[PDB]
Ligand binder design. Structure first.
Ligand SMILES: [K+]
Length: 485
């Protein structure tokens, strides 16, 4: 019970608190600094002594936008941030299911060690092992420089995630987990990351189940990645013959250059900037297309969205964008005729731009991905509708389901100033129980919900709220407008 575990790179020692074994700050890669900046993750150097794993490692450098809201006491920031944390229930049971969390944050914010993602409650209540991790963000993980040097890798942040999953496959049995029953789950950018991981060469065979919360196929073109990369170096004053400077410039300067590029670009309604990029070596094609062709055959998928995603993207006082902007977003998302028709579904207004974000950034992608995967594996869909009744937090905002999934309800106070009532505790128990049962069997059904499989003929969907219900082909009129006739 003293919790010393031998990893492939050396021994680590954790602790036990309230029935949960915990190991924090375990290195899964060599710190991506200096010459290793902008390169694929390398194995960390081995150590012969016992590494103290009772404190979280640093988080990736980033603006304080999310950290200030997520933490009461800000964490240390460093490019040396590639660490995983393990939470396991103190039980005689072996070969436990493993749930690996990929945090959201628009690919430039967040950390696996944010208070909201503490896996103690999930591990204890479900008797599963929970793994959280950090991956390179912003200019460190999603600045695709392959166009300047083949030695550099694009989609660095995704490669870090894959490296962490590889670490889990090779080391989790030593922590009491089943390396052959690994469920990867994530929200927002984390869900979008999982869409990519389900198709990436780097992640082949590294997990057996997936949960995608408010996130699906999302990428920028190879051309867009290259143009942004060139603009980035220009801001830094680095020439094609001064690439060595990319490994010496201060991290703070990389962040400043990144922030400078954003402000220079008129913000879009989806607030998209950093994101995965198409690249022959790391992400050959759009995740949705790859899944539609069977790249994730046999991998059960639990996927969903919140009813009011878009309300977190605007304020009642936000400016109303032009019709041309909305039509541009429609063409981008939909296509040629799909944009033409159904365009009348979003007449200029604050309401329409809110609905467009919910529909085009989250709902349509989720339905498209779920439908595609339904031909190759069991799929289960949900729509989260819960929220406090009193304004102004009376909307099922993007990310509002997170406190329920992890069981860390203090997060609801900062997200919606909501009180932890019996209804809230009950809903968290129901949602967490479903996530756990899915990790264990590939079917999210519980005593509170007999979940119907999602397929294109009936599109049966579970509605998560104080009272669980099922809707058959929800928002059918909207679906018919957003998809080919
Ligand atoms: K022991």
């Amino acid at each position: 019970t003293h919790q010393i575990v031998t990893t492939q790179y050396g021994k680590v020692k954790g602790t036990t608190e309230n029935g949960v074994h915990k190991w924090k700050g375990i290195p899964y890669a060599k710190p991506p600094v200096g010459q290793w900046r902008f390169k694929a993750p390398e194995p960390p150097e081995v150590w012969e002594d016992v590494l103290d794993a009772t404190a979280y490692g640093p988080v990736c450098p980033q603006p304080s936008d999310l950290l200030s809201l997520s933490y009461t006491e800000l964490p240390r920031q460093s490019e040396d941030c590639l660490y995983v944390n393990v939470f396991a229930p103190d039980t005689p049971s072996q070969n436990l299911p493993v749930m690996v969390w990929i945090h959201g944050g628009a690919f430039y914010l967040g950390a696996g060690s944010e208070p909201l993602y503490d896996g103690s409650k999930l591990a204890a209540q479900g008797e599963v092992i929970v793994v959280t991790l950090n991956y390179r963000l912003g200019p460190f993980g999603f600045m695709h420089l392959s166009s300047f040097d083949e030695a550099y890798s694009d989609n660095l942040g995704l490669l870090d995630q894959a490296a962490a999953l590889k670490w889990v496959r090779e080391n989790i049995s030593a922590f009491g987990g089943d390396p052959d029953n690994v469920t990867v789950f994530g929200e927002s950018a984390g869900g979008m990351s999982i869409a990519a991981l389900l198709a990436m060469p780097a992640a082949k065979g590294l997990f057996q189940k997936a949960i995608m919360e408010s996130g699906a196929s999302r990428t920028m073109t190879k051309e867009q990645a290259a143009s942004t990369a060139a603009a980035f170096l220009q801001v830094l004053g680095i020439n094609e013959s001064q690439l060595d400077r990319l490994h010496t410039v201060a991290a703070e300067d990389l962040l400043k250059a990144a922030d400078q590029l954003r402000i220079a670009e008129k913000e879009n309604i989806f607030q998209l900037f950093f994101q995965p990029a198409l690249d022959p070596k790391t992400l050959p094609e759009e995740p949705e297309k790859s899944i539609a062709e069977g790249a994730a055959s046999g991998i059960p998928l639990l996927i969903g969205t919140t009813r009011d995603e878009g309300y977190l993207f605007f304020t009642s006082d936000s400016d109303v964008r032009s019709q041309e902007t909305l039509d541009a977003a429609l063409e981008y998302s939909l296509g040629k005729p799909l944009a033409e028709k159904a365009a009348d579904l979003y007449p200029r207004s604050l309401e329409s731009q809110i609905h467009m974000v919910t529909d085009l950034l989250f709902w349509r992608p989720a339905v498209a991905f779920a439908s595609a995967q339904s031909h190759y594996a069991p799929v289960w869909m949900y729509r989260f509708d819960w929220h406090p009744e009193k304004p102004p937090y009376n909307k099922a905002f993007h990310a509002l389901e997170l406190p329920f999934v992890f069981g860390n309800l203090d997060g609801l106070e900062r997200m919606a100033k909501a009180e932890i009532t019996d209804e809230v505790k009950q809903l968290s128990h129901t949602i967490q129980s479903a996530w756990i049962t899915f990790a264990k069997t590939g079917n999210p059904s519980t005593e509170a919900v007999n979940w119907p499989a999602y397929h294109e003929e009936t599109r049966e969907t579970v509605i998560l709220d104080s009272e669980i219900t099922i809707e058959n082909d929800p928002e059918s009129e909207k679906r018919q407008k957003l998809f080919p006739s």
